[PDB]
Amino acid sequence: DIFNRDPRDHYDLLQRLGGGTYGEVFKARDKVSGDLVALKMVKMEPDDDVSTLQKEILILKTCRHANIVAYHGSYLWLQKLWICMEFCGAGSLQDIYQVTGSLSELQISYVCREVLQGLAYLHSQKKIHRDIKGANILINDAGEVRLADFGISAQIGATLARRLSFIGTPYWMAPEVAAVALKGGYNELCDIWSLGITAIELAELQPPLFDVHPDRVLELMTKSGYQPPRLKEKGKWSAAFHNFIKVTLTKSPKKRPSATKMLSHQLVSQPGLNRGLILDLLDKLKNP
Amino acid sequence: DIFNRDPRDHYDLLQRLGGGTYGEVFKARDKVSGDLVALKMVKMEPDDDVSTLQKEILILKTCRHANIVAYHGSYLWLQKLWICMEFCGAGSLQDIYQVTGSLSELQISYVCREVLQGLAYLHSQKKIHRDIKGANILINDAGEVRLADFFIGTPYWMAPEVAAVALKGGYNELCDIWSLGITAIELAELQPPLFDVHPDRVLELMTKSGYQPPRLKEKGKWSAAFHNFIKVTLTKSPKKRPSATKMLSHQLVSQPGLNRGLILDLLDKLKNPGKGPSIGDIE
Ligand SMILES: CC1(C)OC(=O)c2ccc(Nc3ncc(-c4nnco4)c(N[C@H](CO)c4ccccc4)n3)cc21
Ligand SMILES: CC1(C)OC(=O)c2ccc(Nc3ncc(-c4nnco4)c(N[C@H](CO)c4ccccc4)n3)cc21
Numbered sequence: 001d002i003f004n005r006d007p008r009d010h011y012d013l014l015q016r017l018g019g020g021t022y023g024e025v026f027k028a029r030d031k032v033s034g035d036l037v038a039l040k041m042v043k044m045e046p047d048d049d050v051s052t053l054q055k056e057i058l059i060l061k062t063c064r065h066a067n068i069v070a071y072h073g074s075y076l077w078l079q080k081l082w083i084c085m086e087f088c089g090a091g092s093l094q095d096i097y098q099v100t101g102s103l104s105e106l107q108i109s110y111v112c113r114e115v116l117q118g119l120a121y122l123h124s125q126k127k128i129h130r131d132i133k134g135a136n137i138l139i140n141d142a143g144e145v146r147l148a149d150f151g152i153s154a155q156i157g158a159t160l161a162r163r164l165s166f167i168g169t170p171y172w173m174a175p176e177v178a179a180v181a182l183k184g185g186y187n188e189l190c191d192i193w194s195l196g197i198t199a200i201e202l203a204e205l206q207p208p209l210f211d212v213h214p215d216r217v218l219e220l221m222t223k224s225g226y227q228p229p230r231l232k233e234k235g236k237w238s239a240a241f242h243n244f245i246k247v248t249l250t251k252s253p254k255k256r257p258s259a260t261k262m263l264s265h266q267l268v269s270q271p272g273l274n275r276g277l278i279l280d281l282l283d284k285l286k287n288p
Numbered sequence: 289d290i291f292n293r294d295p296r297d298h299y300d301l302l303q304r305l306g307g308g309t310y311g312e313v314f315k316a317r318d319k320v321s322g323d324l325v326a327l328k329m330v331k332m333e334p335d336d337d338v339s340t341l342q343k344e345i346l347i348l349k350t351c352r353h354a355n356i357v358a359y360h361g362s363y364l365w366l367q368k369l370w371i372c373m374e375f376c377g378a379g380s381l382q383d384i385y386q387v388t389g390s391l392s393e394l395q396i397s398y399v400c401r402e403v404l405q406g407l408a409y410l411h412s413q414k415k416i417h418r419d420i421k422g423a424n425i426l427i428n429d430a431g432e433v434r435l436a437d438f439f440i441g442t443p444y445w446m447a448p449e450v451a452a453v454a455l456k457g458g459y460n461e462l463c464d465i466w467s468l469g470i471t472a473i474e475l476a477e478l479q480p481p482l483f484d485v486h487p488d489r490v491l492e493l494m495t496k497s498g499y500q501p502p503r504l505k506e507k508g509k510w511s512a513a514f515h516n517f518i519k520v521t522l523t524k525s526p527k528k529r530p531s532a533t534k535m536l537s538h539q540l541v542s543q544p545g546l547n548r549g550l551i552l553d554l555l556d557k558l559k560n561p562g563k564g565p566s567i568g569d570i571e
Binding site for chain 2: 173174180181214218251
């Protein structure tokens with residue numbers, strides 16, 4: 001499927017959006033159609049075990065949904081893997097709230113509905129995002145919401161398949177060992193919890209315990225008496241938003257509702273939720 | 289790792305005991321002492337030899353207990369790693385029950401006590417066997433029982449079950465207690481439960497919400513102590529499952545009359561199932 005041609009043949013590079021250890025990301029325009037796309041250039045040549053890049057592109061190609069970042073194709077030219085994906089002009093919700101500040105309850109309910117639609121699709125295809133957060137929710141110039149960055153789920157998928165699933169007989173394995181061998185010890189409902197933390201992150205600019213050291217947070221959550229977090233200010237939010245947080249953050253995965261069940265909740269089912277709510281957020285981003 | 293010499297200098301190879309992905313295992317005799325050993329020849333595969341050779345052999349040497357199979361040394365000659373270990377004459381309990389048939393409750397109870405002693409030692413050294421089964425419990429010619437054959441993300445958005453797997457790994461040493469319980473059923477019925485079900489279908493059944501721990505098929509054949517030992521070792525919840533030292537106080541393994549003699553009686557049935565001479569005239 002991968003094009004073994006130079007990406008500069010089909011697209012014009014405009015500017016560097018970001019980068020890091022994995023690869024640089026660029027804004028680019030299609031030569032024929034003029035439509036914008038993002039190109040993630042990954043340095044791929046002497047790197048061992050490229051099953052992570054292989055599973056990420058596979059996840060992207062098979063995902064066809066409005067609330068999942070669209071995938072256009074891939075290129076291999078001069079030992080660099082350029083992944084062509086949907087351009088989302090306003091960047092991530094994190095990039096936005098760092099300038100605009102706290103989102104409104106209706107703007108958060110629109111984002112939650114759009115993420116839940118994307119999660120119900122991923123879960124129906126037997127996929128787990130495993131990294132739902134403001135930084136992985138992209139917003140385009142039309143105010144549309146997209147789930148992005150399946151890099152964590154690709155690292156987990158590649159590990160729990162060949163690198164950690166070359167084991168014989170399950171007959172003597174305890175049920176907790178069987179769960180790790182088959183799934184990794186958890187199910188798609190971990191994304192529902194992460195959405196609940198993301199809803200707090202949009203309301204308060206931080207997830208709960210963000211000031212606590214990451215090693216200390218792992219221990220608190222694993223302690224027997226761990227209480228799920230709640231919204232700091234009570235009066236500022238309606239009873240529907242407090243109940244959405246309460247149900248998405250159910251400690252027990254067996255009792256936590258699914259993505260399709262969460263779409264019937266009042267906060268998410270109310271009328272008046274549309275991309276206009278996020279265009280109002282982007283006007284605050286554009287005008288000081 | 290320890291000796292960079294050819295193993296044929298110190299031992300005489302006699303026959304191939306077995307093999308597979310885990311290399312080739314041979315029977316061998318010491319040239320000076322005449323004592324028998326088992327040599328596991330592993331094909332090295334060029335990748336790493338800083339920790340993969342020095343630290344791995346250091347762990348193997350520092351596992352010193354009566355119920356863990358003994359380690360003698362290692363060799364690196366012609367890109368092959370020969371691990372010299374105790375020759376356990378009678379082989380594994382699987383090799384034995386395939387000839388003798390079902391073990392008795394007292395013989396199973398003895399094996400369980402010896403495996404529990406080996407597990408309490410491994411767990412105290414912060415090690416997990418992870419593969420307790422009849423094929424990995426070796427019996428030597430003296431009737432002794434020896435165990436053998438040894439973060440992604442930021443946490444603020446992780447669910448508590450994801451945090452538990454990231455911090456504590458998804459499972460602990462108590463997985464060995466469950467496996468011992470399955471092994472006790474295996475020694476009694478010649479198979480672990482669900483052995484006829486496809487392995488892919490078994491992973492799904494165990495992971496399903498309503499998975500019920502297995503039990504002994506014949507009830508009357510076994511005492512209430514053996515049924516309770518199975519019940520208690522096969523506790524679905526790892527938080528409620530007892531430790532190896534706690535299991536040593538159980539009625540089944542604490543009862544009197546448990547001794548090496550029970551295993552010596554099992555090796556006699558293995559040696560004497562054949563018929564005597566009838567047509568051999570000779571003189
Ligand atoms: C790489 C990633 C996240 O993984 C995918 O699966 C994916 C799909 C489509 C993507 N498209 C896209 N389009 C435009 C912008 C933008 N436009 N203005 C600012 O940013 C943007 N920003 C993100 C968030 O800052 C970004 C993240 C990291 C480095 C650079 C940018 N991302 C981006 C991605
Ligand atoms: C390789 C392994 C299991 O891993 C360790 O840690 C270890 C330690 C000591 C070992 N010593 C040993 N000594 C004698 C016999 C024997 N004597 N008569 C028949 O077999 C034997 N048999 C086993 C079970 O059939 C075996 C298993 C696989 C291939 C060949 C043989 N194993 C064996 C092992």
